[PDB]
Amino acid sequence: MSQSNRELVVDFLSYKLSQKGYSWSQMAAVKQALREAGDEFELRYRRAFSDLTSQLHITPGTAYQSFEQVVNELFRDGVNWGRIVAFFSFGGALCVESVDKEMQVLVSRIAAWMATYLNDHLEPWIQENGGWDTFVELYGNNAAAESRKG
Amino acid sequence: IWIAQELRRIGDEFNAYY
Ligand SMILES: [Cl-]
Ligand SMILES: [Cl-]
């Protein structure tokens, strides 16, 4: 339990630091900025277009086909930070739809597909466009939501 | 490709230095 206990402590402290605008580490800052960006993306998307999850239609036999058809079109002509947030939000919605349909078995698979796509097809762009540090500079401190509300 | 075009709606108009 030693390492699970350290993990629980770190998660809790990271959360409480984030609530006051602080961070446990650079990685925690990235995670937080991405959480906040996803929340805001999904808010904008559902007000304009529909709840994303409600639009998704998955079964274990075609789950990757569903994922790939969307992700390949999203990035067909290139990458930018807004599309990277969209990618995360889509994967989140696909996982929620899967569990809605009693198919939590698909969640691990989706996470793997996302990590692989990030590594193979997004990271090369990220590492030439300022890296995750730039993502935090641009989206951290709930920046996207703050701009809209302004 | 409904979903992806209208992710690219929000994502391009979420995209941020310029
Ligand atoms: Cl650090
Ligand atoms: Cl709402």
Nearest Cα residue to A25 out of A34, A14, A15: A14
Nearest Cα residue to B7 out of A45, A65, A123: A45
Ligand nearest to the backbone CA of A26? 1
Amino acid at A37: A
Cα–Cα distance, A15 to B5 (Å, whole number): 34
Flag if B10 and A41 touch (Cβ within 8 Å): yes
Separation of A46 CA from ligand 2 center, angstroms? 7
Backbone angles phi, psi at A139, to 5 degrees: -120, -10
Neighboring chain B residues of A89 at a CB cutoff of 8 Å: 7
Report the phi/psi class of residue A79: left, alpha or beta, with left for phi > 0 and alpha for psi in -120 to 50: beta
Q: For residues A66 and A111, is the Cβ–Cβ distance under 8 A?
A: no
Cα–Cα distance, A50 to A93 (Å, whole number): 12
Separation of A45 CA from ligand 2 center, angstroms? 10
Q: For residues A30 and A71, is the Cβ–Cβ distance under 8 A?
A: no
Amino acid at B1: I
What sign results for the dihedral spanned by CA atoms A137, A143, A148, B4? Answer: positive
Residue A42: how many other CB atoms lie within 10 Å: 21
Cα–Cα distance, A47 to A44 (Å, whole number): 5
Give the one of A48, A138, A139 whose C-beta lies nearest to B10's C-beta.
Answer: A48
Flag if A70 and B17 touch (Cβ within 8 Å): no
CA angle, residues A147, B1, B4, in degrees to nearest 5: 15
CA angle, residues A112, A118, A122, in degrees to nearest 5: 160
Report domain extents, chain A.
1-150
Asked if the C-beta of B15 comes within 8 angstroms of chain A's C-beta atoms, the answer is: yes
Q: HSE of A118 in the Cβ direction (CA atoms, 13 Å)? A: 15
Flag if B15 and A81 touch (Cβ within 8 Å): yes
Flag if B11 and A86 touch (Cβ within 8 Å): yes
